Enzyme design. Structure first.
Site, mmCIF file in Angstrom:
data_model
loop_
_atom_site.group_PDB
_atom_site.id
_atom_site.type_symbol
_atom_site.label_atom_id
_atom_site.label_comp_id
_atom_site.label_asym_id
_atom_site.label_seq_id
_atom_site.Cartn_x
_atom_site.Cartn_y
_atom_site.Cartn_z
ATOM 1 N N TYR E 333 47.848 39.302 41.053
ATOM 2 C CA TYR E 333 46.710 39.710 41.044
ATOM 3 C C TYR E 333 46.376 40.614 41.872
ATOM 4 C CZ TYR E 333 45.642 35.333 38.583
ATOM 5 O OH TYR E 333 45.558 34.125 37.778
ATOM 6 N N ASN E 481 37.577 32.171 44.481
ATOM 7 C CA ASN E 481 38.140 32.609 43.354
ATOM 8 C C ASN E 481 38.883 34.068 43.594
ATOM 9 O OD1 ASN E 481 37.062 30.656 41.691
ATOM 10 N ND2 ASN E 481 35.277 31.757 42.130
HETATM 11 C C1 F43 Z 1 49.408 25.758 35.047
HETATM 12 C C2 F43 Z 1 48.366 26.649 35.381
HETATM 13 C C3 F43 Z 1 46.877 25.847 35.805
HETATM 14 C C4 F43 Z 1 46.703 26.257 37.429
HETATM 15 O O1 F43 Z 1 45.851 25.908 38.150
HETATM 16 N N1 F43 Z 1 47.486 27.430 37.441
HETATM 17 C C5 F43 Z 1 48.769 27.807 36.443
HETATM 18 C C6 F43 Z 1 50.006 27.762 37.008
HETATM 19 C C7 F43 Z 1 49.923 28.315 38.501
HETATM 20 C C8 F43 Z 1 50.907 28.365 39.270
HETATM 21 C C9 F43 Z 1 52.344 28.672 38.811
HETATM 22 C C10 F43 Z 1 53.362 27.821 39.075
HETATM 23 C C11 F43 Z 1 54.725 28.130 38.369
HETATM 24 O O2 F43 Z 1 55.261 29.276 38.720
HETATM 25 O O3 F43 Z 1 55.309 27.515 37.365
HETATM 26 C C12 F43 Z 1 50.404 29.420 40.494
HETATM 27 C C13 F43 Z 1 51.519 30.206 41.164
HETATM 28 C C14 F43 Z 1 49.574 28.624 41.576
HETATM 29 C C15 F43 Z 1 50.194 27.905 42.780
HETATM 30 N N2 F43 Z 1 50.379 28.345 43.927
HETATM 31 O O4 F43 Z 1 51.188 26.937 42.237
HETATM 32 C C16 F43 Z 1 49.849 30.286 39.646
HETATM 33 N N3 F43 Z 1 49.316 29.939 38.458
HETATM 34 NI NI1 F43 Z 1 48.501 30.868 37.163
HETATM 35 N N4 F43 Z 1 49.087 32.591 37.686
HETATM 36 C C17 F43 Z 1 49.087 33.943 37.282
HETATM 37 C C18 F43 Z 1 48.423 34.359 36.025
HETATM 38 C C19 F43 Z 1 47.852 33.405 35.154
HETATM 39 C C20 F43 Z 1 47.255 33.763 33.907
HETATM 40 C C21 F43 Z 1 48.353 34.331 32.982
HETATM 41 C C22 F43 Z 1 48.101 35.369 31.936
HETATM 42 C C23 F43 Z 1 48.553 34.898 30.581
HETATM 43 O O5 F43 Z 1 49.604 35.686 30.469
HETATM 44 O O6 F43 Z 1 48.246 33.914 29.810
HETATM 45 C C24 F43 Z 1 46.758 32.519 33.214
HETATM 46 C C25 F43 Z 1 45.437 32.336 33.493
HETATM 47 C C26 F43 Z 1 44.865 32.419 31.648
HETATM 48 O O7 F43 Z 1 44.261 31.335 31.293
HETATM 49 O O8 F43 Z 1 44.751 33.369 31.229
HETATM 50 C C27 F43 Z 1 47.280 31.588 34.064
HETATM 51 C C28 F43 Z 1 47.311 30.322 33.903
HETATM 52 C C29 F43 Z 1 47.853 29.073 34.620
HETATM 53 N N5 F43 Z 1 48.067 29.021 36.040
HETATM 54 C C30 F43 Z 1 47.753 27.749 34.035
HETATM 55 C C31 F43 Z 1 48.497 27.568 32.850
HETATM 56 C C32 F43 Z 1 49.923 28.279 32.711
HETATM 57 C C33 F43 Z 1 50.289 28.063 31.317
HETATM 58 O O9 F43 Z 1 51.398 29.389 30.981
HETATM 59 O O10 F43 Z 1 50.957 27.237 30.999
HETATM 60 N N6 F43 Z 1 47.999 32.140 35.187
HETATM 61 C C34 F43 Z 1 48.102 35.757 35.776
HETATM 62 O O11 F43 Z 1 47.314 36.181 35.274
HETATM 63 C C35 F43 Z 1 49.276 36.642 36.810
HETATM 64 C C36 F43 Z 1 49.187 36.268 37.873
HETATM 65 C C37 F43 Z 1 49.657 34.977 38.135
HETATM 66 C C38 F43 Z 1 49.868 34.262 39.433
HETATM 67 C C39 F43 Z 1 51.096 34.392 40.349
HETATM 68 C C40 F43 Z 1 51.253 35.837 40.723
HETATM 69 O O12 F43 Z 1 50.306 36.667 41.102
HETATM 70 O O13 F43 Z 1 52.467 36.394 40.689
HETATM 71 C C41 F43 Z 1 49.858 32.651 39.026
HETATM 72 C C42 F43 Z 1 49.345 31.821 40.080
HETATM 73 O O1 LIG Z 2 44.311 28.864 34.373
HETATM 74 S S1 LIG Z 2 43.491 28.386 35.515
HETATM 75 O O2 LIG Z 2 42.187 28.802 35.439
HETATM 76 O O3 LIG Z 2 43.766 27.045 35.616
HETATM 77 C C1 LIG Z 2 44.332 28.975 37.094
HETATM 78 C C2 LIG Z 2 44.826 30.389 36.790
HETATM 79 S S2 LIG Z 2 46.306 30.799 38.069
#
Ligand code: F43
Ligand SMILES: O=S(=O)(O)CCS
Ligand code: F43
Ligand SMILES: C[C@@H](OP(=O)(O)O)[C@H](NC(=O)/C=C/CCCCSSCCS(=O)(=O)O)C(=O)O
Lengths: 47, 495, 194, 259, 550
Positions: E333, E481
């Site tokens: 992000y 957030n």
């Molecule tokens: C399991 C969750 C629930 C939650 O609380 N966090 C998750 C997973 C978590 C884990 C990832 C664990 C791993 O590497 O396996 C972490 C790193 C949080 C943590 N400290 O553990 C994270 N996400 Ni999320 N997460 C991200 C993102 C996102 C975007 C992904 C966009 C898309 O392509 O769909 C979506 C949100 C959405 O609803 O749109 C997202 C969801 C989700 N994110 C959903 C479902 C994931 C799924 O694919 O099944 N992340 C991103 O948008 C980019 C940044 C990225 C964060 C790590 C980084 O900055 O490198 C990461 C940040």
């Molecule tokens: O997709 S969730 O809103 O659960 C968290 C994003 S890292």
């Protein structure tokens, strides 16, 4: 370099006016306003 | 004949090396500074980065809400997953970055259980075996206290607690636990049950080393000001490797001094030089060891290890006898007096010996602190001096507060800590208080003091700091032969 | 390449795991060329920056004595508003033991105001050229500001009979001196000795 | 009325503590140091010049009417507005005639308007400068409360209350304020109490003989007089501790029946 | 069409940035990345040697990583590329030192101390005495003990980053002081900026204490103030020799280390329990003042974007992804706001539109200008995402897109009006317009503060009202957030870059962080992060001299 000039010590930058030149042991020495001898090679003229 | 340019030689004793109690290592006083000793830093790092999570509510959610069946094979798979996820590996969400494994080599997720049948078919790689690490009677006591419950110990990397503060650890563990749960059991990445997991692992089933200190103190959890004395007694693991009650109490005294008086007080609440000679006075030479062994001999000669019930008379007798003996020893041997040149050092050592003796006589920690305070006010009349002014604040109100029942003043010594209102400022008290709390239980031969989970968690052989023999590890760190974690040399240029 | 015999001190060190030298002691290197003066036998001075200079000189082929001052820590009583914490001084026997050497090498610390006055008191009784090995960058003129004879910056009214012949900066107390600093010290000694 | 005792005990140490606490007990004087010499060692003002003031005299300043505040007669230094200064002493653990807590208790029992502070190796009393000089000469320096060998007027660097004495029986000093003159056997103060050198050293007498030190000291020691030899002091200390404990537990007449 | 982000897209993607199709599942998984292979080799060696067979890193469990092409990351205005793993705050020493330098800074004013010394204590204060005190505090601050060899001291090589500096708005005193430990306002700032800062500061003298990094590593952020105060008191009573009593010394101690202390952050209440000097207590104006690009650049967009980059790296990565969540973190992000010139292009378009329509600061803050500027910038950004499929692949998460577009809109509004609250209002309008445009926004709880924002932007209620300069991570809406706070700091800076202000909230913080002795140079945060991602950043706090070589 002469009496009444403005010189600065290259190593520290202390500013002072030349008071007198007092050669000793076949070696030139420069006295500044702080009553401290210096060496001509370690001093240079500024304006 | 008076020449003013001769000068005065000074500090002859401080030039000589400091032995370490119960060891055979000699070290300089400069190497016992908490900033110069990697062993003390690793001690604090290992305590800071430890969080114990009860993985029983999460299993119940998986069984009754998500309809998923939990078996030892599934738990093995989960442990495999979390040992990869907790250091910072990716399990879901394609396209992540990951932390360098070289920076997180000290990161472990361990599991222990009081259920022997479940512990039998568990991968021994991730298992903290209570049967193997503890003697039979101690293992039985710990299992009876813990019960048929399964717990997970998360040791997040030391680099995390070094870059951030101590409040990071619980949140780090909770996020990684939730991720490993949803990826090991093939669940939806985010639903109501996910919130149930998160709440359980964040506060319902979590065990913190130290409570938060909001308000005036202004500090997060897992800081040395939040660690109670019983918790630090349970951190030290000499109870399971030695049967000498004085040795156990003195190892707890050494750990408590090095943690509270050095780190917490000389850095968190002060600065600069800190209080090194205030703390090393309790674990460098055998002075405190000799006084404590005399106290134990006297108690066993006239009372026994638990031969009497805590009353005022026994407190007066034991504390007075031990204080008189310690001050007589200071008078007789000028080496001892010049070693403990400051009055605070002497007062703390004599009072610690008196409190340990009272605890070994009665088995009560509050009687121990009462004896400590009697020793302080008797030292004051014996030598007409106590310590630096500002030292005997808690020692003056102590006698009244030791057995008090009022809200702000009452607490069992195991439940007391650096946030106890009287103990919140002054050096030379807290490590000895932790030692007295431990001695209250070493007299009874107890397996633990306040928390069985902490004892089992710190019995782990994979910890960087060996808590069985804290003084030996401190000596090793003082001699530049202790390997500490949290270093980042793979991400740094060559110097 | 010639035999080098040292007169070890007559008294033992600081305890069992402590240092090997003792305060207020002298170890003659027979042929008196260089004397290394250590403020104390402690870890901040002995074997970390001082015995390293000693073995550097002894490797260069120049016999070396090491003298540990009885009271080498602190500032002299003649410092402005007196001394604080501790008093620095030099004994007449220490001065005589120093003065039979061709050159002196003395190791100083960090604070400039301490070093200048310590050097002034030291050179009030030492009449041979000395080399100041300190950590801080100190200029070869602040000594002349308080009266010390100095090779480059002489004072009008000299209060010392000794000449600060060289100042070497970058040597930290209690830490191993790199080979570059040892080479600089050896070159200065060689060019200012023979 | 109430005739005050001052301290429990039957040993010589307890008697000496009682003597120090007693305001009606005339301390035996063992030397004569002139007022100007005391002022010189103190090092705050130049003798012969007037005292510096911090506020106008109490008559000049205007204060609101206060019946209770006006019941107390002020010190002369307070009346003239003199500044508050200090005098500090370090006492050796080897049979020094006065000891820190003993000093503080005696000061607060004998002197008016004083501020006494006690440390393990230090003791300081603060007062208005004129009265401070008066009772420093009369009580602190000329009497048995001071031994030029085992005790020393010293601010700044205090260290040696627990070290052994040197070859002349003098307490260790890192600044060497006082030196022993072997020719005359007297102790001379070559520096003032903070450490700046004096133009003329001042004679503060000769060290008290060790037998007299044993007889007049206020410290308990295994070699001289042990606390075990004075069971009455230990009993009173234990009584104070038990009374404190009982009062802090439940402060009633019933819980104090177990006293 | 020419866009600032085009070159990075050409470098990152092999196909045309406008091409709508590609192929997947042909890259070999994690083997396509050198960082992942290095991690695998390391994990094997560490497991075998140190872990005694306990597994640490198993790529074979969980998601099969690398089903798509793992893109490299440019850094805005820098011509160097790095993998995404190098930008993780744990793998990047530059980000760690960025937080370390802010954490270990305390500014203490020394004018009450001087006045108390002169009048109450009867001690003369001269520039020579000030130089002596500076020498004393520089020796004593890291670990030193003055003229006391018997006292335990910290190893000097362990605290090579510790400094004590002085600066003053008094010109004559400034030139009478030693230049060894002086922060010269005149030679560090341009003439007009220096004049403004001197007028704001006054004729007062301040000392900056940089506690060694190791102290903050071992302890927390609340240790810094206590360490500074203790060392300052010791140095003051050691340099000036005083014959007054002990009570006067207590008054002097209050005047010297408990009167004019300026901290970087405040303590946090509730579940955010934390001490001072933690990243959650740093206000947005304070962080804008920490970044020093107003010194070396006259471009307002660049000045705002450097603050955006620093705020992202601090708030989103360190604070939120570690202090508040932990785990892999929220690097994604934050990098989205400073990796490619996407936000640079959007902000430059916003500035150009404002300059063409309203002038650089040519309008008073009204609702109509906020609405039209924010709407125009948001529409431009969203159509840029639409017509460049590679751009949409680069910013794959909805949050990273929303934050960038809204930051561009807020910076544009702040340019137009010069009011930070108007800029944040434009940010919120951009967010809801984005939601209606793409039928999408960030994650599940990304827009808690974006639905509450419009009403709280110009509110006057107790817990809702604050100037954007006085807001921070402890503002109730912004508490949790990710993807907002760094952009909020950038908008707060842009409110003042439009006016050409020398500082935003605190002149003392600006002058203090202009210090050349800092390890992390805040003049170019993006360049330093690029250097750290290449393993060429020399960070402090390493205990190399107290550890075995084996
Ligand atoms: C399991 C969750 C629930 C939650 O609380 N966090 C998750 C997973 C978590 C884990 C990832 C664990 C791993 O590497 O396996 C972490 C790193 C949080 C943590 N400290 O553990 C994270 N996400 Ni999320 N997460 C991200 C993102 C996102 C975007 C992904 C966009 C898309 O392509 O769909 C979506 C949100 C959405 O609803 O749109 C997202 C969801 C989700 N994110 C959903 C479902 C994931 C799924 O694919 O099944 N992340 C991103 O948008 C980019 C940044 C990225 C964060 C790590 C980084 O900055 O490198 C990461 C940040
Ligand atoms: O997709 S969730 O809103 O659960 C968290 C994003 S890292
Ligand atoms: C030198 C001072 C000045 C002052 O303000 N405090 C000092 C020094 C201060 C500095 C030392 C560093 C420096 O550069 O000054 C610090 C570290 C303050 C701190 N941050 O805790 C310290 N003392 Ni002190 N200080 C100590 C001690 C002591 C003992 C020394 C007894 C003796 O007679 O020699 C006495 C207190 C007492 O009288 O009971 C003492 C005094 C004093 N202590 C008085 C004495 C002179 C004065 O009147 O100004 N220290 C000790 O008793 C041992 C522990 C030791 C502490 C550091 C360590 O634990 O390593 C240190 C603790
Ligand atoms: C944080 C601070 O609270 P306070 O100063 O507001 O009480 C508190 N410090 C203290 O209570 C006092 C600090 C002094 C350090 C202990 C002295 S050891 S050496 C000095 C001997 S003396 O001459 O001062 O009597 C602490 O927890 O460190």
């Amino acid at each position: 370099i002469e009496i009444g000039s403005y010189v600065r010590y290259i190593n520290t930058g202390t500013h002072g006016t030349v008071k007198a030149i007092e050669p000793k042991n076949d070696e030139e020495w420069v006295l500044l306003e702080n009553d401290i001898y210096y060496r001509p090679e370690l001093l240079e003229l500024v304006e | 004949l008076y020449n003013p340019d001769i000068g005065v030689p000074l500090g002859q004793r401080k030039l000589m090396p400091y032995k370490l109690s119960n060891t055979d290592d000699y070290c300089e006083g400069d190497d016992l500074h908490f900033l110069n000793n990697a062993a003390i830093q690793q001690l604090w790092d290992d305590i800071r980065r430890t969080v114990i999570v009860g993985m029983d509510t999460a299993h119940s959610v998986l069984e009754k809400r998500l309809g998923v069946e939990v078996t030892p094979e599934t738990i093995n798979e989960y442990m495999h997953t979390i040992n990869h996820s907790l250091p910072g590996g990716a399990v879901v969400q394609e396209h992540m970055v990951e932390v360098h494994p070289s920076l997180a080599w000290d990161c472990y997720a361990r599991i222990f259980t009081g259920d022997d049948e479940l512990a039998d078919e568990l991968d021994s790689r991730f298992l903290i075996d209570i049967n193997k690490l503890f003697p039979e009677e101690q293992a039985e006591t710990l299992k009876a206290a813990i019960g048929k419950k399964t717990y997970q110990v998360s040791r997040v990397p030391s680099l995390v607690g070094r870059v951030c503060d101590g409040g990071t650890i619980s949140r780090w563990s909770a996020m990684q636990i939730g991720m490993s749960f949803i990826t090991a059991y093939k669940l939806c990445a985010g639903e109501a049950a996910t919130a149930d997991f998160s709440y359980a692992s964040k506060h319902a089933d979590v065990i913190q080393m130290g409570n938060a200190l909001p308000g005036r103190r202004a500090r997060g959890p897992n800081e040395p000001g939040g660690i109670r004395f019983g918790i630090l007694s349970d951190v030290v693991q000499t109870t399971r490797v030695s049967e000498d009650p004085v040795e156990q109490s003195l190892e707890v005294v050494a750990t408590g001094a090095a943690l509270y008086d050095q780190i917490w007080l000389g850095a968190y609440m002060s600065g600069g030089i800190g209080f090194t000679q205030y703390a090393t006075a309790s674990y460098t030479d055998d002075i405190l060891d000799d006084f404590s062994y005399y106290a134990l001999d006297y108690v066993e000669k006239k009372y026994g290890r638990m031969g009497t019930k805590a009353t005022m008379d026994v407190v007066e007798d034991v504390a007075g006898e031990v204080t008189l003996y310690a001050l007589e020893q200071y008078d007789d041997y000028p080496a001892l007096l010049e070693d403990h040149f400051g009055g605070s050092q002497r007062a703390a050592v004599a009072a610690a010996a008196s409190g340990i003796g009272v605890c070994m006589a009665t088995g009560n920690s509050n009687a121990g602190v009462n004896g400590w305070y009697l020793s302080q006010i008797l030292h004051k009349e014996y030598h007409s001096r106590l310590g630096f002014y500002g030292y005997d604040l808690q020692d003056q109100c102590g006698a009244s507060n030791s057995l008090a029942i009022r809200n702000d003043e009452a607490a069992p010594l195991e439940l007391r800590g650096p946030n106890y209102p009287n103990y919140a400022m002054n050096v030379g008290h807290q490590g000895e208080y932790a030692g007295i709390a431990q001695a209250a239980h070493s007299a009874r031969g107890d397996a633990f003091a306040l928390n069985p989970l902490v004892k089992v968690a710190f019995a782990d052989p994979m910890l960087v700091f060996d808590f069985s023999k804290p003084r030996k590890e401190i000596a090793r760190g003082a001699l530049r032969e202790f390997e500490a974690a949290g270093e980042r040399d793979v991400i740094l240029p060559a110097k | 390449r010639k035999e080098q015999i040292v007169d070890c001190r007559a008294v033992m060190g600081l305890g069992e795991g402590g240092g090997l030298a003792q305060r207020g002691t002298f170890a003659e290197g027979l042929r008196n060329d260089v004397v290394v003066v250590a403020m104390s036998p402690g870890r901040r001075h002995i074997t970390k920056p001082v015995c390293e200079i000693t073995y550097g000189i002894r490797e260069a082929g120049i016999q070396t004595s090491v003298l540990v001052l009885d009271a080498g820590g602190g500032i002299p009583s003649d410092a402005p508003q007196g001394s604080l914490g501790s008093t620095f001084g030099l004994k007449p026997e220490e001065a005589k033991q120093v003065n039979r050497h061709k050159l002196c090498v003395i190791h100083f610390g960090n604070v400039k105001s301490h070093i200048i006055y310590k050097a002034r008191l030291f050179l009030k009784y030492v009449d041979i050229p000395t080399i100041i090995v300190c950590q801080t960058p100190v200029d070869m003129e602040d000594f002349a500001a308080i009266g010390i004879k100095t090779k480059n910056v002489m004072p009008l009214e000299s209060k010392t009979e000794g000449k600060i012949v060289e100042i070497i900066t970058g040597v930290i107390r209690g830490e191993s001196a790199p080979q570059k600093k040892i080479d600089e010290i050896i070159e200065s000694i060689k060019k200012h000795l023979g | 009325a109430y005739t005050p005792q001052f301290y429990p005990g039957a040993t010589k140490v307890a008697e000496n503590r009682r003597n120090h606490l007693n305001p009606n007990y005339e301390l035996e004087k063992l030397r004569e140091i002139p007022d100007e010499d005391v002022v010189k060692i103190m090092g705050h003002r130049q003798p012969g010049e007037d005292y510096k003031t911090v506020h106008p005299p109490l008559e000049e300043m205007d204060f609101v009417e206060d019946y209770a505040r006006d019941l107390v007669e002020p010190l002369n230094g307070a009346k003239e507005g003199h500044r508050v200064r200090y005098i500090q002493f370090a006492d050796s653990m080897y049979f020094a005639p006065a000891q820190p807590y003993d000093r503080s208790r005696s000061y607060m029992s004998r002197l008016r308007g004083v501020d006494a502070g006690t440390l393990s190796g230090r003791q300081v009393v603060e007062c208005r400068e004129s009265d401070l000089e008066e009772f420093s000469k009369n009580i602190l320096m000329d009497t048995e409360l001071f031994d030029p060998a085992t005790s020393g007027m010293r601010g700044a660097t205090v260290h040696g209350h627990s070290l052994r004495l040197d070859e002349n029986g003098m307490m260790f000093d890192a600044l060497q304020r006082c030196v022993f003159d072997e020719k005359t056997g007297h102790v001379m103060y070559v520096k003032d109490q903070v450490g700046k050198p004096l133009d003329a050293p001042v004679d503060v007498g000769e060290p008290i003989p060790e037998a007299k030190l044993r007889e007049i000291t206020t410290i308990y020691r295994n070699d001289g007089v042990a606390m075990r030899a004075d069971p009455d002091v230990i009993e009173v200390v234990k009584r104070i501790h038990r009374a404190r404990t009982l009062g802090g537990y439940i402060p009633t007449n019933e819980t104090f029946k177990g006293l």
